Amino acid sequence: TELFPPNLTRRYFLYFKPLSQNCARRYRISSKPL
Protein backbone atom coordinates (compact mmCIF):
# COMPACT_ATOMS: atom_id res chain seq x y z
CA THR A 1 0.00 0.00 0.00
CA GLU A 2 1.48 3.30 -1.20
CA LEU A 3 -0.50 6.48 -1.78
CA PHE A 4 -0.05 8.53 -4.93
CA PRO A 5 2.70 11.15 -4.83
CA PRO A 6 1.06 14.50 -5.59
CA ASN A 7 2.99 15.03 -8.83
CA LEU A 8 1.36 11.96 -10.42
CA THR A 9 -2.23 13.06 -11.10
CA ARG A 10 -1.79 16.68 -12.12
CA ARG A 11 -1.98 17.09 -15.95
CA TYR A 12 -1.60 20.84 -15.36
CA PHE A 13 0.96 23.48 -14.42
CA LEU A 14 1.10 26.96 -12.92
CA TYR A 15 2.30 30.29 -14.30
CA PHE A 16 2.85 33.85 -13.10
CA LYS A 17 2.59 37.39 -14.43
CA PRO A 18 4.10 40.61 -13.02
CA LEU A 19 3.05 44.24 -13.56
CA SER A 20 4.61 47.53 -14.68
CA GLN A 21 1.45 49.59 -15.21
CA ASN A 22 -0.03 52.64 -13.46
CA CYS A 23 -1.24 50.26 -10.74
CA ALA A 24 2.39 50.39 -9.64
CA ARG A 25 2.04 54.19 -9.85
CA ARG A 26 -1.07 54.03 -7.67
CA TYR A 27 0.80 53.09 -4.48
CA ARG A 28 3.21 50.46 -3.19
CA ILE A 29 9.31 47.52 -8.83
CA SER A 30 9.19 43.74 -9.21
CA SER A 31 9.02 44.16 -13.01
CA LYS A 32 11.58 46.78 -13.92
CA PRO A 33 13.33 45.82 -17.18
CA LEU A 34 16.86 45.37 -15.90
Binding site: R25, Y27, R28
Partner: protein, 199 residues
Protein backbone atom coordinates in the same frame (compact mmCIF):
# COMPACT_ATOMS: atom_id res chain seq x y z
CA UNK B 1 39.03 33.17 23.18
CA UNK B 2 40.04 34.78 26.48
CA UNK B 3 43.62 36.03 26.15
CA UNK B 4 43.42 36.49 22.36
CA UNK B 5 40.48 38.85 22.87
CA UNK B 6 41.55 41.38 25.52
CA UNK B 7 43.71 43.39 23.14
CA UNK B 8 40.82 43.01 20.72
CA UNK B 9 38.62 44.28 23.56
CA UNK B 10 41.05 47.13 24.34
CA UNK B 11 40.90 48.21 20.70
CA UNK B 12 37.09 48.34 20.89
CA UNK B 13 37.30 51.12 23.45
CA UNK B 14 40.33 52.68 21.77
CA UNK B 15 39.40 53.51 18.18
CA UNK B 16 36.02 55.09 19.00
CA UNK B 17 37.85 58.41 18.98
CA UNK B 18 39.32 57.49 15.57
CA UNK B 19 35.78 57.49 14.18
CA UNK B 20 34.68 60.59 15.99
CA UNK B 21 34.79 61.96 12.44
CA UNK B 22 33.28 58.85 10.82
CA UNK B 23 30.42 57.92 13.16
CA UNK B 24 28.39 60.48 11.27
CA UNK B 25 29.63 59.04 7.98
CA UNK B 26 28.68 55.46 8.79
CA UNK B 27 25.07 56.34 9.58
CA UNK B 28 24.45 59.16 7.09
CA UNK B 29 25.14 56.89 4.12
CA UNK B 30 22.48 54.39 5.16
CA UNK B 31 19.65 56.65 6.35
CA UNK B 32 19.00 57.64 2.75
CA UNK B 33 19.22 54.00 1.71
CA UNK B 34 16.42 53.62 4.26
CA UNK B 35 14.78 56.59 2.50
CA UNK B 36 15.46 55.99 -1.19
CA UNK B 37 14.21 52.41 -0.97
CA UNK B 38 11.27 53.19 1.32
CA UNK B 39 10.22 55.99 -1.08
CA UNK B 40 11.22 54.70 -4.53
CA UNK B 41 8.06 56.21 -6.03
CA UNK B 42 22.12 51.60 -3.03
CA UNK B 43 25.63 52.00 -1.63
CA UNK B 44 27.90 49.25 -0.30
CA UNK B 45 29.33 49.18 3.21
CA UNK B 46 32.57 51.14 2.87
CA UNK B 47 34.25 52.69 5.90
CA UNK B 48 37.47 54.45 4.99
CA UNK B 49 39.68 54.31 8.06
CA UNK B 50 42.61 56.62 7.46
CA UNK B 51 45.90 55.17 8.60
CA UNK B 52 46.86 58.52 10.15
CA UNK B 53 44.08 58.59 12.77
CA UNK B 54 45.07 55.12 13.94
CA UNK B 55 48.79 55.92 13.83
CA UNK B 56 48.39 59.27 15.60
CA UNK B 57 47.83 57.90 19.09
CA UNK B 58 48.35 54.13 19.02
CA UNK B 59 51.52 52.13 18.50
CA UNK B 60 50.94 48.52 19.58
CA UNK B 61 47.50 48.60 17.99
CA UNK B 62 49.17 50.09 14.89
CA UNK B 63 52.29 47.94 14.62
CA UNK B 64 50.36 44.69 14.33
CA UNK B 65 48.54 45.83 11.20
CA UNK B 66 51.81 45.91 9.24
CA UNK B 67 53.49 42.87 10.82
CA UNK B 68 50.82 40.24 11.56
CA UNK B 69 47.61 41.28 9.79
CA UNK B 70 45.97 37.92 10.41
CA UNK B 71 44.58 38.34 13.93
CA UNK B 72 43.56 41.95 13.68
CA UNK B 73 40.98 42.58 10.95
CA UNK B 74 37.90 40.66 12.36
CA UNK B 75 38.48 42.67 15.53
CA UNK B 76 37.75 45.89 13.65
CA UNK B 77 34.78 44.28 11.94
CA UNK B 78 33.33 43.13 15.26
CA UNK B 79 33.29 46.60 16.77
CA UNK B 80 31.96 48.01 13.53
CA UNK B 81 28.90 45.81 13.21
CA UNK B 82 27.60 46.53 16.71
CA UNK B 83 28.06 50.25 16.14
CA UNK B 84 25.55 50.14 13.29
CA UNK B 85 22.49 48.70 15.03
CA UNK B 86 23.23 50.63 18.24
CA UNK B 87 23.18 53.71 16.04
CA UNK B 88 20.22 52.66 13.87
CA UNK B 89 18.03 49.60 14.43
CA UNK B 90 14.39 50.83 14.69
CA UNK B 91 13.68 50.53 10.92
CA UNK B 92 13.07 46.85 10.20
CA UNK B 93 26.53 42.27 5.17
CA UNK B 94 29.14 42.77 7.92
CA UNK B 95 30.48 46.28 6.98
CA UNK B 96 33.99 45.21 6.06
CA UNK B 97 36.82 47.69 5.69
CA UNK B 98 38.59 49.60 2.91
CA UNK B 99 41.75 50.68 4.79
CA UNK B 100 43.25 53.62 2.91
CA UNK B 101 46.22 55.75 3.91
CA UNK B 102 49.98 55.79 3.46
CA UNK B 103 52.28 52.84 4.03
CA UNK B 104 55.97 53.73 4.35
CA UNK B 105 57.86 51.79 1.65
CA UNK B 106 55.57 48.95 0.70
CA UNK B 107 55.32 49.88 -2.98
CA UNK B 108 56.58 46.47 -4.03
CA UNK B 109 56.56 46.36 -7.81
CA UNK B 110 55.62 42.71 -8.49
CA UNK B 111 58.73 42.19 -10.57
CA UNK B 112 60.21 42.05 -7.08
CA UNK B 113 58.78 39.66 -4.51
CA UNK B 114 58.98 39.76 -0.74
CA UNK B 115 61.23 37.60 1.36
CA UNK B 116 60.31 39.21 4.69
CA UNK B 117 56.76 40.62 4.37
CA UNK B 118 55.09 37.47 3.24
CA UNK B 119 51.53 37.46 4.64
CA UNK B 120 51.59 41.21 5.24
CA UNK B 121 50.19 44.43 3.81
CA UNK B 122 51.36 45.41 0.35
CA UNK B 123 50.62 48.20 -2.13
CA UNK B 124 50.74 47.13 -5.77
CA UNK B 125 50.29 49.11 -8.98
CA UNK B 126 50.28 48.15 -12.64
CA UNK B 127 47.97 47.38 -15.55
CA UNK B 128 45.42 44.57 -15.82
CA UNK B 129 44.98 42.50 -18.99
CA UNK B 130 43.07 39.36 -17.97
CA UNK B 131 39.52 40.28 -16.80
CA UNK B 132 38.03 36.83 -16.22
CA UNK B 133 34.43 35.87 -15.50
CA UNK B 134 31.91 36.80 -12.83
CA UNK B 135 30.14 34.08 -10.90
CA UNK B 136 28.17 33.94 -7.64
CA UNK B 137 29.09 31.81 -4.64
CA UNK B 138 27.27 31.01 -1.41
CA UNK B 139 28.41 31.67 2.12
CA UNK B 140 25.37 30.46 4.05
CA UNK B 141 22.09 28.70 3.32
CA UNK B 142 19.04 28.30 5.56
CA UNK B 143 17.59 24.81 5.76
CA UNK B 144 13.96 24.23 6.69
CA UNK B 145 11.88 21.29 7.87
CA UNK B 146 8.39 21.35 6.37
CA UNK B 147 7.17 18.94 9.03
CA UNK B 148 7.10 20.72 12.45
CA UNK B 149 7.57 23.99 10.51
CA UNK B 150 10.99 25.04 11.79
CA UNK B 151 14.09 26.27 9.98
CA UNK B 152 17.79 25.50 10.24
CA UNK B 153 20.96 27.47 9.72
CA UNK B 154 24.35 26.56 8.32
CA UNK B 155 27.44 28.40 7.11
CA UNK B 156 29.92 27.03 4.58
CA UNK B 157 33.38 28.59 4.71
CA UNK B 158 35.90 28.84 1.87
CA UNK B 159 39.11 30.68 0.97
CA UNK B 160 37.31 34.01 1.26
CA UNK B 161 37.37 34.66 5.04
CA UNK B 162 40.98 35.76 4.27
CA UNK B 163 42.52 35.15 7.65
CA UNK B 164 41.37 32.13 9.63
CA UNK B 165 42.45 28.63 8.66
CA UNK B 166 39.04 27.00 8.71
CA UNK B 167 38.42 23.28 8.38
CA UNK B 168 36.81 23.17 4.93
CA UNK B 169 33.20 22.13 4.39
CA UNK B 170 33.08 20.56 0.91
CA UNK B 171 29.34 19.87 1.05
CA UNK B 172 26.87 21.35 -1.40
CA UNK B 173 23.52 20.68 0.28
CA UNK B 174 23.62 18.63 3.49
CA UNK B 175 20.13 17.13 3.47
CA UNK B 176 18.30 14.95 6.02
CA UNK B 177 19.46 16.37 9.34
CA UNK B 178 18.99 14.30 12.51
CA UNK B 179 15.20 13.96 12.21
CA UNK B 180 12.74 12.38 9.81
CA UNK B 181 11.99 15.55 7.86
CA UNK B 182 12.54 15.93 4.13
CA UNK B 183 14.50 19.16 4.25
CA UNK B 184 13.75 22.36 2.36
CA UNK B 185 15.74 25.58 2.03
CA UNK B 186 14.51 29.12 1.35
CA UNK B 187 17.10 30.27 -1.18
CA UNK B 188 15.65 33.77 -1.20
CA UNK B 189 16.54 33.84 2.48
CA UNK B 190 20.00 32.54 1.58
CA UNK B 191 22.97 34.76 0.82
CA UNK B 192 25.52 34.88 -1.96
CA UNK B 193 28.69 36.64 -3.10
CA UNK B 194 30.81 36.72 -6.24
CA UNK B 195 34.41 36.27 -7.36
CA UNK B 196 36.58 37.70 -10.12
CA UNK B 197 40.11 36.64 -11.01
CA UNK B 198 42.28 39.33 -12.60
CA UNK B 199 46.00 39.30 -13.38
Amino acid sequence: PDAVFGDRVRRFQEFLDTFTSYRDSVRSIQVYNSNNAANYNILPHRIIISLDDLREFDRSFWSGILVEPAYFIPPAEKALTDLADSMDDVPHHPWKLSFKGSFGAHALSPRTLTAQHLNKLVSVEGIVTKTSLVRPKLIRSVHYAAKTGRFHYRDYTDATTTLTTRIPTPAIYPTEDTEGNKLTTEYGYSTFIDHQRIT
